[PDB]
Symmetry: D2
Subunit: 255 residues, 4 copies
């Protein structure tokens, strides 16, 4: 198959829910080996039980801790023999205006969304440099391109993700390590449902409709639709792409 | 399959050589029906004879002529029953500085690269509106994003392509017609080899070496590597993408 | 005065109304010499009679005619001794969807908005090369960056303007000819008020209220606010800027 | 005057050297009151002695400390009566590849370049909300737009700056607080000269010659040329601009 993901090993941060879990399913469906690095044990174990797949491994990981990042990379190499693709998908959203935001909250957002991406990438790159090739895919956002209202720390973190992506692409291209990002729009995931309710008036269904209408396609994205972009970026279909940002936003950033 | 291109009808302008023909091969490999609309009849007919594939059809087309564009769309509908995807790949490059460029040459570049894209899209859209869905993929360029040196009319036409892409995406999203573009870097095709030789001192091989070095990946792209982006954009893998520009440039625009 | 525009010669296309005329007033206020190239002779002569300013000259010009473009540039040089700044401001808007747009209408939009900018720039550049320096400022649009709904040919033209700007900047930097563009949002001019009324149901005041709300600043721009960006781009203040796009859109493109 | 900066109070972080100090001079020249917040007390005191201007005040400030940021804002309000403009110019560069970079160094870059910008903005915004208006100008970089080689943490931080700029613009536009950034290219400052020598073979003069050649204008920028963009952004000339990035890079990002 043209995508050529079979028997590749893919390490996905934040893989036990949402887009990350859709990515786990998509990569397992391509017969790739998947290592999930995520912070919640019960949630990781529930994923493993449901998938019931010898190509899947869960490693509890706090990506803000460098030792834990190193351990996650090692777990992939030990469990499956190597590491072909790192997907830095973990991220959090805290809603607060700049003039009110607690420094501790600012730091939490940047630490998970940006520092953790740095630390994971650092340890993956040490392996990929030695292996002579690799692929890093970062989950950016529409918020790395334009500003979503009311989430300035999140948007700032995602601008950091965008430029970290381009930077690693430029610095590592000579080493055959491709680095790209996906920039999702508004995706229908349980974490987003929670944020929808917390931050808007209305029932869940009313708010989903409101959020759908800001996109030209007039619907929210599904997590599988972002997973499918990650398949493409990991695959050989994207072999001449590095330093690219791929919007998957139902047209949001085209207007 | 996950790409879901089997039995889809794909009309490719400029399909009889270069990136266009690589796209023909990629789509035929997915069991799509392919209609090639291109200007050199002998070349098209030779492609058909060589391929010997009943899913391929050639229709001689000058895309600067509206009646010919309408006829190409009709040919797809008559030959294969419908039209699912239009790939506006035809384009030309004329090298001249602004201060010396002939108006006739300026017009030629804009007519093929931009007006012809409009005219093909116009007639494909009439059909796709009635079909209730569709997909348009435009060949843009790195030159639609940054300026390549010494080809200002080309760059201008490709900025037009970029914005035509976004505009059709915004205006037709509610009709389930996705519209995206690919932005290739420097691709090794026989046609580009001609431009290399005409615009630089040295042997062909010397000049190719020089062109390779300007990209982080340190090589020229292959036409199949652009075809594969087109496959993704046509496929269901990209279902939440519209109004997107996908760069495939070895990192060129990341620096 | 730090902007230092006194005795600079500025040629403004489309200068006899709207943003163009606000620019005329702004530049005359800075004691620059201003040559207006615009299509309506009566309108231009009325402007000259009203302004009663020896620093102002009007030359009737159809910018789609190359001889007229050459004559406009020559008239600036002959009248005031040189040509320091060309402002390519002329543009038109035709409202039509791609699937219905007449080829003749498509061509009109591209001819005025893009080809006329090429032709004016060609002839200005011949002069500026000989002078050893120059400055070209192009009126782009938010529509060169994202798609405004329902005006696809306009947006395409302005993507062309954006890339033509970058291209001339790259190609002529070594000749000390700086080339930049302004990307206005929705600007309150009598011409736009006519378009508002022609293309929407409601009173002028209702339509303006609706158009204001789409921008973070919650208001339309005044023409003088775009003229003031042009003052900056023409001035010495922008001496290290070339190939850049300055958005003046009340925040529209930041979301 | 048209810029209307007389008696406006401007707080400039990193104001005691380089671009920051050129901005100090430019704003003092417009009869604005200037408060410099910078980390080196001796350097600040030497600046004050040299400028010898009652419109200048220095307050030693570590912008990574929230209390110090608050104290800097308070010093502006207490010394001159209010705060009209915040210029977040402070930044540092550490050169290291991702795969080798120390977390402590990553954190230093992000803390100064991005967290400090957040904390200064937070406390400035509290004042500006109460005042009913304001202006924030952030020093971004070409590195916020594309990747400069070998400084990935720096580029990441500047992508953060870009998006923080857009976010505050979107969130505070309704409060009449404009927020924009400048994206400088390679600027000739004593601090950059030290980096040039540290990170390249050759004499200073040789290295400056090499750095100049990567820009279409074929020279490095002067710090005053960035200060002049800041004047424009603070001034009423930019009244319809918010959420904008102004590149001042000699054409670097146009290619």
């Amino acid at each position: 198959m043209i995508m050529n993901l079979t028997d590749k090993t893919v390490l996905i941060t934040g893989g036990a829910s949402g887009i990350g879990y859709a990515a786990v399913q998509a990569f397992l469906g391509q017969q790739a080996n998947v290592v999930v690095a995520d912070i919640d044990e019960a949630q990781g174990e529930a994923m493993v039980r449901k998938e019931n797949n010898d190509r899947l491994h869960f490693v509890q990981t706090d990506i803000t801790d460098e030792a834990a990042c190193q351990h996650a990379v090692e777990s992939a190499v030990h469990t499956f023999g190597g590491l072909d693709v790192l997907i830095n998908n973990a991220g959090i959203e805290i809603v607060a205006p700049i003039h009110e935001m607690e420094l501790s909250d600012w730091n939490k957002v940047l630490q998970v969304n940006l520092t953790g991406m740095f630390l994971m990438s650092k340890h993956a790159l040490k392996h990929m440099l030695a292996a002579g090739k690799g692929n890093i895919i970062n989950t950016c956002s529409v918020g790395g391109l334009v500003a979503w209202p009311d989430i300035p720390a999140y948007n700032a973190s995602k601008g950091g993700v965008l430029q970290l992506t381009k930077s690693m692409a430029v610095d590592y291209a000579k080493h055959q390590i491709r680095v790209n990002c996906v920039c999702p729009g508004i995706i229908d995931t349980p974490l987003n449902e929670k944020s929808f309710l917390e931050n808007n008036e209305g029932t869940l269904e009313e708010i989903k409709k409101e959020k759908a209408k800001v996109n030209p396609l007039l619907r929210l994205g599904k997590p599988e639709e972002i997973a499918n972009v990650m398949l493409f970026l990991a695959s050989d279909l994207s072999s001449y792409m590095t330093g690219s940002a791929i919007t998957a936003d139902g047209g949001y950033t085209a207007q």
